[PDB]
Each structure stands twice: as structure tokens, then as C-alpha cells.
Write a protein that binds this ligand. Structure first.
Ligand SMILES: Nc1nc2c(ncn2C[C@@H](COCP(=O)(O)O)OC[C@@H](O)P(=O)(O)O)c(=O)[nH]1
Ligand SMILES: Nc1nc2c(ncn2C[C@@H](COCP(=O)(O)O)OC[C@@H](O)P(=O)(O)O)c(=O)[nH]1
Lengths: 215, 211
């Protein structure tokens, strides 16, 4: 939550706190902005699920609905790969707000299904890093809904790019909004590069095909 | 940054006012964990910074290439218990200026194919008996043939060693007890906690239901 300083070096490259980022054209959101919006999002999510009830799978002898506890946590589906840093930070923030949850990962590239089998009648939250065309999440929502029929199925995204929509999809929860540009940093990649950066940047167009070689 | 560890009215372990009824005791608070990882990031950095390996960015070049954004350090992370640890770690690695990329493998899966002649580092949450990592190391070394293959762990429990395996890099050393928090869990519970706790034995079988 430390305040970040955005500037330019002598070469004219975008710098954040003295560190130069030659691949960046501009700054979408510094680390401070990102975590501030995730802390408030955690509180938003906590308020939305705190008093909710879903099917009891801890005790199968019970027929009544059960509140969200450690026995019957919120089911969080994290979308590999870009969402793993976003998810790691968020679940800890959710813990601060006292929201019981468990995470299973799925790998989608428009492939690697869930290990969880009890999603029926459960409150499920999908954690995706970014929504652009909306195709990835639209396909994922109807797939999860058809195969499991959860009590609820909402989507939380770190970054939303509404200007790039091609289908009818709206994330219930949105941490940040970005312009219709290719962004990098904090999960966002260019052939797995720049993923571990602490800020979200607009990528220079001349860096789009920087690393075409197979990893 | 430093965390206040105490006890509430019921004798339950508390960290920063928040009670943890499942905890027997605190292994390491968030501040300690993060301090260790920052130092480990520096250790890793100084160990790979000057290293050189196969250039796959430019296959036209036959000479070895330094670790750059073109040819990054290959990091293999093990789902699921190691993703939070890996998340924090790669960022500290970014601070220390070490280019790296991460692929995940689930064991209880690698999509990267070009590890040959590359420096590879495995990020694992815990090493106990050593069986999990000894098997993973041998599999990679014969099915990818890397230039180097070292393991970095968050928690080492050397009193649990029953096979021939010693991780090159260790953040925290713990006794032979079952721990929860910060990646470690019991049936996926308590994984999101910011600290590592010794679990009460009675809580070991608290969630027998399949997820
Ligand atoms: N780095 C980066 N990637 C983007 C961006 N916008 C879209 N992608 C692709 C994909 C990310 O996932 C990883 P990958 O598996 O695709 O490599 O997300 C697809 C959904 O946004 P969609 O368009 O709704 O389907 C962006 O601004 N930056
Ligand atoms: N929460 C927690 N988990 C632990 C602990 N000790 C070991 N594990 C997990 C174990 C495999 O667990 C299967 P999974 O559910 O994680 O997939 O991993 C041990 C291998 O590293 P080993 O060295 O070969 O024995 C511990 O103290 N606390």
C-alpha cells in the first residue's frame, strides 16, 4: 500500500519507483492502486457471501441449507495461469474479512478440469485475471453451470476491458478497469514474460512479438 | 510489519488480535515468512545472475546465453499448495532483478517443452519425507535433461527425511509436526491464512468430506 512514483528515466522509458520498465508504454495501475482495490473488493465479496447459505456437504446427513463456514466454504475457481498471483493475494484478503473459502484451479486457453466434485447447490466464485472479449468467461460460466448447477455462479475479475467486448458478458465483481489495450504485469504476460511485475502496464506495440520462441 | 502473537480468553492462539482455534502454536508469522523469502530471493538471485544456459530465443546462436528476458530462469511450481508461495516469491525475484517464467505441475502436467540445457528451479511448499521431490527431480532430469535442477522450498522438515533428498534452498526449518496456513492446509482449509501454525492433532480429521 506504499505510494508509488511514476516517472521517466533519461532514455525515456516508463519507470516506477526508480525501476525502469522498457516494455511499458504507460501505467494502468501501480501496486498500491491494485492492492487498494483488492482490499475493498475483498470486503465487497465478504459482504456478498457472508450471510449466504448453500448445500451441506460436510454433513451429508443434514437436509437443511448450511451457512458459509469452514465446514462448507465458498468455492473459488481460479483460472490458470494469469490468475494465480491475483488469487493468492485475494484469498488472503478474504481471510482478513473472515470469509471461509477453498480454491481449485482450471487451465483454459481459447483443457484441465477441476478436482472438486461437489459444486452442485454450492455458492461458486470464479477468479479470472482479465475479461476482454468476454468469450473465455462466457464459455466458462455456461460450462460450469451445465455440469454442476451451483446455487450461484459469479465472476470476479482483477481487470475488466469492457471496450473489447464481443459477447454479452458482465463480471459481477470488478477490481480495476483498463482501456482496450494489451496490458502486462501482475499476472498479465507476453509469452510468460513480465508476469511477476508488481504493476499493470500498457505494453508497447513493438513488444507484442518480442518472444515468439516456444518455452 | 511485525506480528503480535498472544492468547485470548480461551487459550486459543491469536495473531494480531485474530484467534486461530485450530492452531496449537505459531511456526512463523507473516512478517518472518516474508523476511525469509526476501533474503531467499537475494540468495537465488546471486546464484543464477551470472549463470548461462541454452539460447532458445535465438536458435541461430550456438554459444550459451545469460539469464535474461530472452532466456529466463525456468521455474516449476507444484499445485496446489505452492501457488501462494510462488506468487510472492517471483515478485521478490523481480525486485532482485532475476528474469524468470513459471509453469505449474499438479502432483498428489508441464506445458513447457524446452527445458533442455536450461537452468531449472523447482518451487515447493514443503519437504518432509522427501519422496515427492525425489520423484519429481528424477522425472524432470531424464525427461527434459536440464543444465541444472535445484529445489527451493518454503518449509523444510529435515527430521522427516526417509529418502536421499536435500533441497538446495530453504526458507524456513520446522519440526516434524503437521503445519497449516500460507499454502499448507487440511482438505484445502486454512490455506489462505497469512501465517504458519502447528495444527492441533484433533483438527487433523475435522473435514473428512470430499471436495
Ligand atoms: N496479457 C494479456 N492477455 C490478454 C489480455 N486480454 C486478453 N488476454 C488473453 C487472455 C489472458 O489469458 C492468458 P492466455 O491463455 O490467453 O495466454 O484473456 C482472455 C480474456 O480476456 P477474453 O478476451 O474475454 O477471452 C490482456 O489485456 N493482456
Ligand atoms: N498441510 C501440510 N501438508 C503437508 C505437511 N507435510 C507434508 N504435507 C503434504 C505432503 C503431500 O500431501 C499431499 P497434498 O494434499 O499436498 O497434495 O507433502 C509432503 C511431501 O513434500 P514429502 O516430503 O515427499 O513427504 C504439513 O506439515 N502440512
Amino acid at each position: 500500500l506504499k505510494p508509488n512514483v511514476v516517472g521517466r528515466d533519461a532514455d525515456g522509458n516508463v519507470t516506477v519507483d526508480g525501476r525502469s520498465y522498457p516494455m511499458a508504454e504507460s501505467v494502468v495501475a501501480t501496486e498500491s492502486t491494485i492492492h487498494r482495490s483488492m482490499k475493498e473488493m475483498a470486503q465487497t465479496l465478504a459482504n456478498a457471501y457472508k450471510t449466504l447459505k448453500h448445500r451441506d456437504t460436510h454433513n451429508k446427513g443434514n437436509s437443511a441449507l448450511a451457512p458459509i463456514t469452514d465446514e462448507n466454504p465458498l468455492i473459488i475457481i481460479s483460472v490458470l495461469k494469469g490468475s494465480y498471483i491475483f488469487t493468492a493475494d485475494m484469498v488472503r484478503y478474504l481471510g482478513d474479512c473472515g470469509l471461509p473459502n477453498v480454491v481449485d484451479f482450471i487451465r483454459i486457453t481459447s483443457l484441465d478440469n477441476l478436482r472438486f466434485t461437489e459444486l452442485t447447490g454450492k455458492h461458486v466464485l470464479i477468479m479470472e485475471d482479465i475479461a476482454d472479449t468476454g468469450r473465455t468467461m462466457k464459455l466458462l460460466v455456461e460450462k460450469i453451470r451445465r455440469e454442476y448447477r451451483p446455487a450461484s455462479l459469479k465472476v470476479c475479475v482483477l481487470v475488466d476491458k469492457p471496450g473489447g467486448r464481443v459477447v454479452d458478458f458482465k463480471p459481477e465483481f470488478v477490481c480495476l478497469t483498463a482501456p482496450t489495450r494489451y496490458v502486462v504485469g501482475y499476472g498479465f504476460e507476453v509469452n510468460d514474460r513480465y508476469r511477476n511485475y508488481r504493476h499493470v502496464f500498457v505494453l508497447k506495440p513493438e513488444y507484442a512479438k518480442r518472444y515468439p520462441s516456444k518455452l
